[PDB]
Amino acid sequence: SGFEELPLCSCRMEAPKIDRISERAGHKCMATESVDGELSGCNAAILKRETMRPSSRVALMVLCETHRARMVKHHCCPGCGYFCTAGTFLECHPDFRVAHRFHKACVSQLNGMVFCPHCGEDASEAQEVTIPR
Ligand SMILES: [Zn+2]
Ligand SMILES: [Zn+2]
Ligand SMILES: [Zn+2]
Ligand SMILES: [Zn+2]
What we know:
The PDB classes it as transferase. The entry lists the keywords cysteine-rich region, zinc-binding, transferase. The assembly is monomeric. The entry is titled "Structure of the cysteine-rich region from human EHMT2". The strands form three sheets. Strands 2-1-3 form a three-stranded mixed β-sheet. It has a three-stranded antiparallel β-sheet with strand order 5-4-8, with no helix packed on it. A two-stranded antiparallel sheet has the order 6-7. It has one domain (about 5-130). The relative contact order is 0.20. The chain has helices spanning about 20-25, 65-70; strands at about 30-35, 40, 85, 85-95, 100, 110, 115, 125-130. By secondary structure, the chain is mainly β. Helix content is about 10%, strand content about 25%. The N and C termini lie far apart (about 40 Å). It is built from two helices and eight strands. The structure holds zinc ion (4 copies). One zinc ion binds next to loops.
């Protein structure tokens, strides 16, 4: 029932390159962009072979430098693992020029209430945002 049970994201964590994830991907970025439910790939050439993911709900990804930059800004949804770069989505604003992006359907849920899946702040606080492509 308490805040301690809320999941927090892993957007800032990095896993070592010991599982050959980059090699199986051809050293191409594994990011998936979501724009109002339309999914698209990246496959840009990667520079670092360490892997990342916003939560353990999804598999680890090797990423291009642009998508690693967006991942550490909490622009990837921990619920589904898709990046929120354009279209409509929710943003939690814990501090100046900090935005945690996520889909309305991907909020954390505890005791019937909804929370930011990055940081655990109440999601009724979350603003709806529309960003052009
Ligand atoms: Zn990429
Ligand atoms: Zn995050
Ligand atoms: Zn999502
Ligand atoms: Zn948050």
